[PDB]
Ligand binder design. Structure first.
Ligand SMILES: C[C@H](NC(=O)N[C@H]1[C@H]2C[C@@H]3C[C@@H](C[C@H]1C3)C2)C(=O)N1CC[C@H](c2ccccc2Cl)N1c1ccccc1F
Ligand SMILES: [Zn+2]
Length: 664
């Protein structure tokens, strides 16, 4: 029955470190047997059934069992359990590298593609075939046993380099000391939170919750100059030496695999296809954003002439790198004047939850229902069952993990826990997602309360949840959010547009003391502040995108001298002499190198689908809402991103609604 939820979630969240250890050993041994069975099938004897189907069946089985093993490390309250889960994940990733080089299994399905008729199977089954083979050729399984052994060795070193790149940055404990006057305009809240030293000064570390208040609030420009120099010289000379190995290594592995650059290797699985497509996209957007950034630099500079005159400071006549977050925060509090704290009194969390669940149910045609006596990894976690309003089909379930505790993931995320694919016995699996965020912890005084940028995160992360749950595919590889990486953030960013709508904000806002709405003047101050500092904030995302694209196109360039080049040519705010920002850029050694363009790439598509389709036909209209559910969310990764796009807009998308978003 695809019309109940009973029996369909049996994920266990109370596993002991011993249970995790042994389930990990048993899953590796059992999955290996299937690979082993396939790889010794005579080529005369292979079928769709005994190669491609047994591979898909073990892939679903692998994914679900893995979730019980690698997810406790992110949400559990027992440290011994989070540690078994971290070790399981390491041991299971060791197993995946091993499986990625199984040429015996790769040879069996190349043969199947060679013989069997491609037009007597399902289009998605054809896709599972073609992309499993493309997978093995992107690992070089079709190549000789000699460069493969060398490619294997080269990749194990990239792994070491990437580990050490971030381990360096995380083991850093660089601090400056300051006085109460050298920390001007910073709140008593922030300064009471700081340690004091033996010469009775205030210790400010270089970590994110210390660095960013100071750069945004401190009225002493020399304190800002010192903190920015320290911030962008973190692991300066040792992470430069890692990039000098890692980036040419990516160029070399890619050329062995038949790709010109590492960026080309990455982009093949993306909707932007090529490096020149990305390059022109990024270049023709800075030419677009140029006079808007010329206007913003002009205004910020005049704020600085004003300020230095009043405070008794010298005026150099530039916006330095340690001056930008300061006067952008002034711009936010001078032009647009939204108190982001008297506004947070209007968003209590019972109300935001209830009216976010209201919007999506009405828009997509769904029915959410909380599970009573629910198995959970924590007491504070809820469970909802998701139905289709018309049929009563149970599509899936989402957990809501809202509040911060020790051991918990401290970023916002949607974890897919179960794929909405087919099961080996012909049946359908229920989708299971987890919304994991850290909204401000409830204290016995008032209700827990949300800032507007927290409502924006709630909404962003719930469209991932709906993408995961509404998706229905035949194979687990295409299930849920498993689309292109420059497309994963379209269903998320598109629904952020709702928290910038007047009518919709009223469904979320209710003062926690009576229940009188936000007034009209405040609601209008709000949605007018959508494009504060847009130019200089968007030009700085392009700088980082041009940087990520450059180091994976020409690996013979100084990373710091490229960052300097883009900072002055695109941003208009110069990189500081002596700094090395790319040596602190954790994305280059995170999993998404060559992929930074894809968050501006994805905004254009969601701006098009919102302005040309939703804003036009009514943004709560359940006919655009069902067409969005069916032609974007439902097919998952079983169709291409630009095809799902054109089935909806009924045309190739353009940047017009994106330029009209920013106001150009
Ligand atoms: C890196 C690894 N690559 C291959 O296994 N490549 C083979 C070789 C190269 C091509 C062709 C053939 C199948 C696949 C793709 C051999 C991989 O993707 N793994 C590791 C086991 C699991 C899996 C993948 C595919 C089918 C079944 C399973 Cl259990 N899968 C996996 C791991 C973590 C999460 C989700 C997953 F799905
Ligand atoms: Zn996201």
């Amino acid at each position: 029955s695809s019309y109940t939820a009973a029996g369909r979630n049996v994920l266990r969240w109370d596993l002991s470190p011993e249970q995790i250890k042994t389930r990990t050993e048993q899953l590796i041994a059992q999955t290996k047997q299937v690979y082993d069975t396939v790889g010794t099938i005579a080529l005369k004897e292979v079928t769709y059934e005994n190669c491609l189907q047994v591979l898909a069946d073990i892939e679903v089985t692998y994914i679900v069992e893995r979730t019980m093993l690698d997810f406790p490390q992110h949400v559990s309250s027992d440290r011994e359990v989070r540690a078994a889960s971290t070790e399981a994940d390491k041991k299971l990733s060791r197993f995946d590298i091993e499986m990625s080089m199984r040429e015996d299994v790769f040879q069996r399905i190349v043969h199947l593609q060679e013989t069997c008729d491609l037009e007597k199977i399902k289009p998605e089954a054809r896709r599972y075939l073609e992309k499993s083979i493309k997978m093995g050729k992107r690992n070089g399984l079709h190549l000789s046993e000699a460069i493969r052994n060398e490619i294997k060795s080269m990749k194990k070193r990239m792994s070491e380099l990437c580990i050490d790149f971030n381990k360096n940055l995380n083991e850093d404990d660089t601090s400056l000391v300051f006085s109460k006057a050298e920390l001007g305009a910073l709140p008593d809240d922030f300064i009471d939170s700081l340690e004091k030293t033996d010469e009775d000064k205030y210790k400010v570390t270089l970590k994110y919750p210390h660095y960013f208040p100071v750069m945004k609030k401190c009225c002493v420009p020399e304190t800002r100059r010192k903190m920015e120099m320290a911030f962008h010289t973190r692991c300066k000379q040792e992470n430069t030496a890692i990039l000098q190995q890692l980036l040419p290594l990516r160029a070399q592995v890619a050329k062995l695999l038949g790709y010109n650059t590492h960026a080309d290797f990455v982009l093949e699985l993306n909707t932007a296809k090529s490096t020149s497509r990305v390059a022109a996209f990024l270049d023709d957007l800075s030419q677009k954003l140029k006079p808007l950034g010329e206007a913003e630099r002009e205004f910020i500079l005049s704020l600085k002439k004003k300020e230095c005159e009043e405070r008794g400071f010298e005026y150099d006549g530039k916006i330095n790198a340690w001056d930008l977050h300061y006067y952008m925060t002034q711009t936010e509090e001078l032009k647009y004047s939204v108190d982001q704290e008297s506004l947070k009194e209007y968003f209590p969390i019972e109300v935001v939850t209830e009216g976010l669940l209201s919007i999506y149910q009405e828009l997509l045609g769904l029915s959410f229902e909380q599970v009573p006596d629910a198995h959970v990894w924590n007491k504070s976690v809820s469970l909802y069952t998701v139905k289709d309003k018309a049929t009563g089909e149970v599509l899936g379930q989402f957990y809501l993990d809202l509040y911060p505790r020790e051991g918990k993931y401290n970023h916002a995320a949607c974890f897919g826990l179960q794929p909405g694919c087919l099961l080996p016995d012909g049946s359908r699996m229920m989708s299971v997602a987890a919304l994991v965020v850290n909204f401000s912890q409830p204290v016995a005084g008032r209700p827990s309360l949300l800032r507007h940028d927290e409502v924006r995160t709630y909404f962003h992360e719930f469209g991932h949840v709906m993408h995961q749950i509404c998706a229905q595919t035949d194979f687990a590889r295409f299930s849920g959010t498993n689309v292109e990486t420059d497309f994963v953030e379209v269903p998320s960013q598109m629904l952020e547009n709702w928290v910038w709508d007047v009518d919709s904000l009223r469904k979320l806002s209710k003062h926690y003391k009576d229940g009188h709405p936000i007034t009209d003047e405040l609601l209008e101050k709000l949605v007018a502040s959508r494009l504060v500092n847009t130019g200089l904030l968007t030009l700085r995302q392009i700088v980082l995108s041009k940087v990520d694209q450059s180091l994976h196109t020409n690996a013979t360039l100084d990373a710091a001298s490229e960052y300097a080049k883009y900072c002055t040519e695109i941003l208009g705010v110069a990189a500081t002499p002596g700094t090395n920002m790319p040596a602190t850029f954790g994305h280059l050694a995170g999993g998404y190198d060559g992929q930074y363009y894809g968050y501006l790439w994805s905004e254009v598509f969601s701006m098009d689908m919102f302005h040309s389709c939703f804003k036009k036909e009514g943004i709560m209209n359940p006919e655009v809402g069902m067409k969005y559910r069916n032609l974007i969310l439902k097919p998952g990764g079983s169709l291409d991103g630009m095809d799902m796009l054109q089935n909806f807009l009924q045309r190739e998308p353009n940047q017009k609604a994106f330029l009209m978003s920013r106001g150009l």
